[PDB]
Design an enzyme around this catalytic site. Sequence first.
Site, PDB file in Angstrom:
ATOM      1  CG  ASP A  39      -2.233   0.668   1.024  1.00  0.00           C
ATOM      2  OD1 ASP A  39      -3.256  -0.024   0.903  1.00  0.00           O
ATOM      3  OD2 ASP A  39      -2.255   1.902   0.982  1.00  0.00           O
ATOM      4  CG  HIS A  69      -5.174   3.880   1.476  1.00  0.00           C
ATOM      5  ND1 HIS A  69      -4.751   2.626   1.079  1.00  0.00           N
ATOM      6  CD2 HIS A  69      -6.479   3.971   1.103  1.00  0.00           C
ATOM      7  CE1 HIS A  69      -5.766   1.975   0.535  1.00  0.00           C
ATOM      8  NE2 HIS A  69      -6.832   2.758   0.559  1.00  0.00           N
ATOM      9  CG  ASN A 161     -13.865   1.292  -2.971  1.00  0.00           C
ATOM     10  OD1 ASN A 161     -14.149   0.208  -2.437  1.00  0.00           O
ATOM     11  ND2 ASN A 161     -12.874   2.066  -2.535  1.00  0.00           N
ATOM     12  CB  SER A 224      -9.123   0.460   1.217  1.00  0.00           C
ATOM     13  OG  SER A 224      -8.858   0.803  -0.130  1.00  0.00           O
TER      14      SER A 224
END
Length: 279
Positions: A39, A69, A161, A224
Amino acid sequence: AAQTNAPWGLARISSTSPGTSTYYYDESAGQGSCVYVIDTGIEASHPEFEGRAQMVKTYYYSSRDGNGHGTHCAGTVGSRTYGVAKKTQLFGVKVLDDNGSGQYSTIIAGMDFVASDKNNRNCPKGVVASLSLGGGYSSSVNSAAARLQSSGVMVAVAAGNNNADARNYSPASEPSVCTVGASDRYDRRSSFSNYGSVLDIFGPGTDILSTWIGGSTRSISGTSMATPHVAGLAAYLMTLGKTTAASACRYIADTANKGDLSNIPFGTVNLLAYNNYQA
Ligand SMILES: [Ca+2]
């Protein structure tokens, strides 16, 4: 064990019903397992990781998470307060920059890097990876997922998403890994979550309180956020001896809370990650 007034999603993957706020879990808490968060990095200095997090690879000029994130996702895996497997070892692989983006070829590199590096780590209970990222279908990105899984890592990927069928997204569509859709605290499918027969499982993804950079904490939403609940759960189950990295997606499906989400299209599993610890 019990952790009262927990973020709703930890309570939820230890509950049969929604609407509770205690997280019931076995205290071994993922000791002896390893989870790679692939990530934007991990602010390892955060008190909430307690020395159990290490960057081990960045494809950018810096290994620091300058976006938050990665730090958020990693916190749901394994932070002391907000995490599932509160005693697992975390390893950060910064493939995405600080705006959260990243080129496919950097992402593939980071994935093959875990298949190998795991051999440089002590992870006697099992090794997991968590990929809270995805972009359009690519055979190559999917193949890098599959290699990672085949090498004996439990791979957990965000379904996306866009509200679609995830069969058009990568690494989500790949079959052989564990593709995670999202839910909310009222057991609705999250309004942004992708769907489609390539999903294996749902976890908590809407208003997920976890860590952030600067030492801080925020609630954010996304597949996520759902993804590291299943990664951390996989670590927790390895450690307990219930399952293995190659078997964990199936074990989680077999032991899920079955029927319980509304807003599921026809053809998508109605399965919700559960630790089968309180009942
Ligand atoms: Ca699978």
